[PDB]
Amino acid sequence: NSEADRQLLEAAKAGDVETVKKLCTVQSVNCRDIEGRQSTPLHFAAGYNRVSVVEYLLQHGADVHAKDKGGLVPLHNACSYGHYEVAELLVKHGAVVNVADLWKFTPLHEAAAKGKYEICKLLLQHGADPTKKNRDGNTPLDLVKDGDTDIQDLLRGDAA
Amino acid sequence: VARPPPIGAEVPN
Numbered sequence: 001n002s003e004a005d006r007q008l009l010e011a012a013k014a015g016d017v018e019t020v021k022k023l024c025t026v027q028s029v030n031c032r033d034i035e036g037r038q039s040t041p042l043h044f045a046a047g048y049n050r051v052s053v054v055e056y057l058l059q060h061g062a063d064v065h066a067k068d069k070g071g072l073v074p075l076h077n078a079c080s081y082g083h084y085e086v087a088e089l090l091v092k093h094g095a096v097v098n099v100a101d102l103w104k105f106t107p108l109h110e111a112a113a114k115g116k117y118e119i120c121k122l123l124l125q126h127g128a129d130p131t132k133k134n135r136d137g138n139t140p141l142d143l144v145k146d147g148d149t150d151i152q153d154l155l156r157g158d159a160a
Numbered sequence: 161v162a163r164p165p166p167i168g169a170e171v172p173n
Binding site: 036037044046047048049076085101103110 | 163164165166167168169171172173
């Protein structure tokens with residue numbers, strides 16, 4: 001990476017909007033972190049709940065569909081750690097809720113496995129499919145832990 | 161090849 005790209009990525013990880021504003025260009029907004037997993041600034045801002053930076057990035061050309069080395073999109077990252085506002089923002093900017101990574105995990109597999117009730121609810125409201133099997137043959141419902149009966153209820157979708 | 165945890169953390173709003 002160029003020193004400037006490195007600086008932008010750290011600024012995104014940190015939620016440093018003022019620095020992001022300084023460095024963010026057409027050329028850099030979707031740069032990849034070569035030293036990590038080819039994460040974009042938006043991947044980092046999403047995983048670390050940097051809401052103001054996610055807003056800025058999304059308004060300035062950031063790619064919600066960018067895949068990292070594992071095939072993860074920034075929505076996977078937000079969903080894994082329960083970042084509701086970030087997830088909501090990504091979906092508003094056209095994130096596809098059923099997109100799958102290299103292990104065929106969707107963001108709903110992730111939210112389910114991580115026990116994130118509101119994230120699961122948000123994804124389902126936007127048409128996420130709780131029946132999609134990953135590489136292991138597991139659906140998101142399969143990945144819900146025994147005691148998370150609320151998330152089970154949600155993904156099972158009993159008639160209502 | 162195992163799937164690694166996604167990049168991120170449980171950073172409070």
